[PDB]
């Protein structure tokens, strides 16, 4: 009875960086908007994963979105093949991972995560 939830400001359309679907905007994203937190299963050390680190840089745990039942729609955001295509960057605000829009994003554009650079 339940479909996986995708907010209505986004759409799944054919990805331009991988086979299958990717997450696209269905309306504009303004520079500075942030999305999340990223959801996943908390793993101890032993893509679809984010290390979560403490104030001092020590690894607290890994968030693993491999299982769709324990994650959310941020898992559909593919990695940017080259840093020029990136329009989201991962920020760890406290202990949560958020995806931050680092430029304005037009409607009908695939969201692609990468590193903040310069």
UniProtKB/Swiss-Prot annotation:
Subcellular location: Nucleus
Domain SET: 8-116
Tissue/organ expression: Widely expressed with highest levels in colon and ovary. Tends to be silenced in breast, colorectal, gastric and liver cancer tissues.
Disease note: Brittle cornea syndrome 2: A disorder characterized by extreme corneal thinning resulting in corneal rupture after minor trauma, blue sclerae, keratoconus or keratoglobus, hyperelasticity of the skin, and hypermobile joints.
Quaternary structure note: Interacts with EHMT2/G9A, GFI1 and HDAC1.
Family stated for the protein in its record: Belongs to the class V-like SAM-binding methyltransferase superfamily.
Role this protein plays: Sequence-specific DNA-binding transcription factor. Represses transcription at least in part by recruitment of the histone methyltransferase EHMT2/G9A and histone deacetylases such as HDAC1. Regulates hematopoiesis-associated protein-coding and microRNA (miRNA) genes. May regulate the expression of proteins involved in extracellular matrix development and maintenance, including fibrillar collagens, such as COL4A1 and COL11A1, connective tissue components, such as HAPLN1, and molecules regulating cell migration and adhesion, including EDIL3 and TGFB2.
Name the record gives this protein: PR domain zinc finger protein 5
Organism of provenance: Homo sapiens (Human)
Gene name tied to this protein: PRDM5
Portion of the full sequence shown: 1 to 126 of 630
């Amino acid at each position: 009875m339940l479909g996986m939830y995708v907010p209505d400001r986004f759409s799944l359309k054919s990805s331009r960086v991988q086979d299958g679907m990717g997450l696209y905007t269905a309306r504009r994203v303004r520079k500075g908007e942030k999305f999340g937190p990223f959801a996943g299963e908390k793993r101890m050390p032993e893509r679809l994963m984010w290390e979560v680190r403490g104030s001092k840089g020590e690894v607290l745990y890994i968030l693993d979105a491999t299982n769709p039942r324990h994650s959310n729609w941020l898992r559909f955001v593919h990695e940017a093949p080259s840093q020029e295509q990136k329009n989201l960057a991962a920020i760890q605000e406290g202990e949560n991972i958020f995806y931050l829009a680092v430029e304005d994003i037009e409607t009908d554009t695939e969201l692609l995560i990468g590193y903040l650079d310069s």
